[PDB]
Each structure stands twice: as C-alpha cells, then as structure tokens.
Amino acid sequence: MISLIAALAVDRVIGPWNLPADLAWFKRNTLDKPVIMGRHTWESIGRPLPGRKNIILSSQPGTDDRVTWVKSVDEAIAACGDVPEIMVIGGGRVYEQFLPKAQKLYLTHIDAEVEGDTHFPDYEPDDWESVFSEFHDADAQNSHSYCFEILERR
C-alpha cells in the first residue's frame, strides 16, 4: 500500500518552523520503509535517509550511487518490491501523481500562515476518514503548535 506524508502550513502551503517533534514523527512513520521523492526534494535533503530504501524520481539519469534512480511513477513503485507500505515524501509534483493511488495520508498541520509556492494537492473530504489526531502547542523545542493526523481512504 501507498502512503503520503507531508508537513503543511496554513492553506496547505508545503511550499519558518523548527519542529523537532515533527521530525520525530516523520522518522518513526518512515523507518524501514521505501521512500519515494522527486529530485528537488532529494536535493534539499542532501544525503540519503539512513535506514530506508531511497528512490529518486527524475526524468534524466541518476547522479549519485547512494540512492535508486527511476524514470516513472510505475518504475518507482516497482522498485519498492513487496513491502506492506511505501512512503511518498514529496514534493508537490510527486504528491499530485501519488495522491490518486494513496490509501493513507500522515499530516502535520502547523499553525504558521506563510506565503508559499507549493500547495499539497486538494484531497476530497468525502474520500477520507481521520483515524488519528493529536494536538500539541509550541514549547521549548517546538516553535509552533501542530497536529498529527492520519487519514484513511474510505
């Protein structure tokens, strides 16, 4: 099964905060699972996420032997093999391709209105059921209030 995970500010801007807690959530949800990303996302991360299989989506040839390079959405899924759940880590463009096939979403709603580039694709209220929610305020470490949510395709 295919799963998308994203950290969204207000108005689904994914495109200012310092949320160690979210990185803690992100890591635990992805550990030991294939991670699919677009080249731009790969580029900002800058090194492979240790303990996951890293699959990069690009139209051109791979430039780094530390991850697996693929040329289509289909090949990306084939590269994962037989695992229970595949995690789509972004960005915008990969979100939009993967959304229609995703069965689960893992979101963090950050209270931070920013003017941004990429929005998380609109998902239909009707296709999703929230099966987990957990609200947390800003504290020492975390700069903003945020909410962990998990949705499932009904």
Ligand SMILES: [Ca+2]
């Ligand atoms: Ca990203």
